[PDB]
Amino acid sequence: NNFYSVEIGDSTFTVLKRYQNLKPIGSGAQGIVCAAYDAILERNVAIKKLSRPFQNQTHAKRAYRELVLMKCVNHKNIIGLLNVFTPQKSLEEFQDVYIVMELMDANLCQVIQMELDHERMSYLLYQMLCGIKHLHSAGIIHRDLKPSNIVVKSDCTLKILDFGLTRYYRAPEVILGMGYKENVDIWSVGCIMGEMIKGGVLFPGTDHIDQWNKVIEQLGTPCPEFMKKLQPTVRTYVENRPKYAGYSFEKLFPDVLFPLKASQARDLLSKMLVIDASKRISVDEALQHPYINVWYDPSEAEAPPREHTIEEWKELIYKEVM
Amino acid sequence: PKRPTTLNL
Ligand SMILES: COC(=O)c1c(Cc2ccc(S(=O)(=O)CCO)cc2)c(=O)c2ccc(F)cc2n1-c1ccccc1
Structure with missing residues (x-):
């Protein structure tokens, strides 16, 4: 109820309602990236949906390291973490991780x-x-x-x-x-x-x-x-x-x-x-x-x-x- | 000097 879905190519982005007007801005091997407007913060943000985070141990270790480092590094000359969330309600259902970051131009x-x-x-x-x-x-x-x-x-x-x-x-x-x-x-x-x-x-x-x-x-x-x-x-x-x-x-x-x-x-x-x-x-x-x-x-x-x-x-x- | 406040995109 706090979530809504938008189809981005072959990818379904289910995000918090605060994030509006998602459009794709590029991809890496580490997932698709959408630009979005954060209504709550009143600014543009990047939302990254993690590609198969626990598909295997290599992926899992990568997702984990990325997350922890993002929580510890804070500097105006480095892209910062604004939010982390999942639309799944428990550990058993848990599939997707979304990472909300600062957006540049x-x-x-x-x-x-x-x-x-x-x-x-x-x-x-x-x-x-x-x-x-x-x-x-x-x-x-x-x-x-x-x-x-x-x-x-x-x-x-x-x-x-x-x-x-x-x-x-x-x-x-x-x-x-x-x-x-x-x-x-x-x-x-x-x-x-x-x-x-x-x-x-x-x-x-x-x-x-x-x-x-x-x-x-x-x-x-x-x-x-x-x-x-x-x-x-x-x-x-x-x-x-x-x-x-x-x-x-x-x-x-x-x-x-x-x-x-x-x-x-x-x-x-x-x-x-x-x-x-x-x-x-x-x-x-x-x-x-x-x-x-x-x-x-x-x-x-x-x-x-x-x-x-x-x-x-x-x-x-x-x-x-x- | 003053810091640049513009960059042409
Ligand atoms: C190709 O994308 C990037 O280089 C990129 C930018 C630069 C950018 C480009 C276009 C727009 S826009 O299109 O919203 C123009 C706004 O008026 C905004 C910002 C960012 O600022 C940016 C911020 C955070 C992020 F996690 C990825 C980002 N990426 C990016 C890089 C590699 C793969 C996917 C995304």
């Missing part, structure tokens, strides 16, 4: 090819890095940052969409099979910043092996010390790839592409787009970089931080909804 896909100025560019990046820093402080390393999972509003505010784990934006540590740390996410910020500037994808590798080629062509074969850190097998390949000296950052990003600021933009990129993670700039040091630091505000850029049966997962998820 677009993802970055389009925004980044519409050339921006230094103020808007640096400000968006600043917001990205605050969101990232906050994720890291909650012990979350994203690893899959890309323009499709970064959303913006027409007032120039920006939010990271999800908690991550197109191959174009993944760090060398991930591409190859290395370990990783916090600044893995900085590689992605470099690729996105890079795109915004040159108008197109920095490393548009047509597969995982081509992806590598794209990088060394433009940045230059990494040092022999880096080469060591690799496995037996992949090191063989990487080390047997033809030496490239790569191009300087002046050639990779000339003045022609920019509207002193151009000079700093380039300097930041040269510190972000560095194959060897042990020499790549960090998140803190990037928030402090001259190009980004103009916007600083410690309330934004500093804010304080096993195995089950399907039947058990169902119970834990149901309790997390209640």
Whole structure:
């Protein structure tokens, strides 16, 4: 009686009456997403209906982790949780979970090819890095940052969409099979910043092996010390790839592409787009970089931080909804 | 500088 149903494609969305005018806005493997107006809050929201949450243990563990993390992370530069509900009345009937989140206006896909100025560019990046820093402080390393999972509003505010784990934006540590740390996410910020500037994808590798080629062509074969850190097998390949000296950052990003600021933009990129993670700039040091630091505000850029049966997962998820 | 309040969609 508190619920009503709307058909969205092949999907039936049964939601609380407060949510009105549902229309689909996209999908992932993790379910269909509708935009809706929350009458009670008087604002637009995203409603995500979870795809087969306890179909199996892999799905169940994913749904559970997503839910718990969403309840613990809270920051203006990360998509927040507004509500969680199920239309089923008991554990035995329990089938569906709905997640109500903040709605923005677009993802970055389009925004980044519409050339921006230094103020808007640096400000968006600043917001990205605050969101990232906050994720890291909650012990979350994203690893899959890309323009499709970064959303913006027409007032120039920006939010990271999800908690991550197109191959174009993944760090060398991930591409190859290395370990990783916090600044893995900085590689992605470099690729996105890079795109915004040159108008197109920095490393548009047509597969995982081509992806590598794209990088060394433009940045230059990494040092022999880096080469060591690799496995037996992949090191063989990487080390047997033809030496490239790569191009300087002046050639990779000339003045022609920019509207002193151009000079700093380039300097930041040269510190972000560095194959060897042990020499790549960090998140803190990037928030402090001259190009980004103009916007600083410690309330934004500093804010304080096993195995089950399907039947058990169902119970834990149901309790997390209640 | 003032923070941008507009972004062309
Ligand atoms: C493609 O969708 C997204 O990128 C997306 C946006 C950006 C967006 C796009 C279109 C509208 S609109 O169409 O309502 C225009 C409003 O006037 C609003 C917001 C969001 O703001 C957004 C917010 C929350 C969410 F959990 C998913 C979201 N998605 C999204 C991403 C991947 C898959 C499914 C949905």
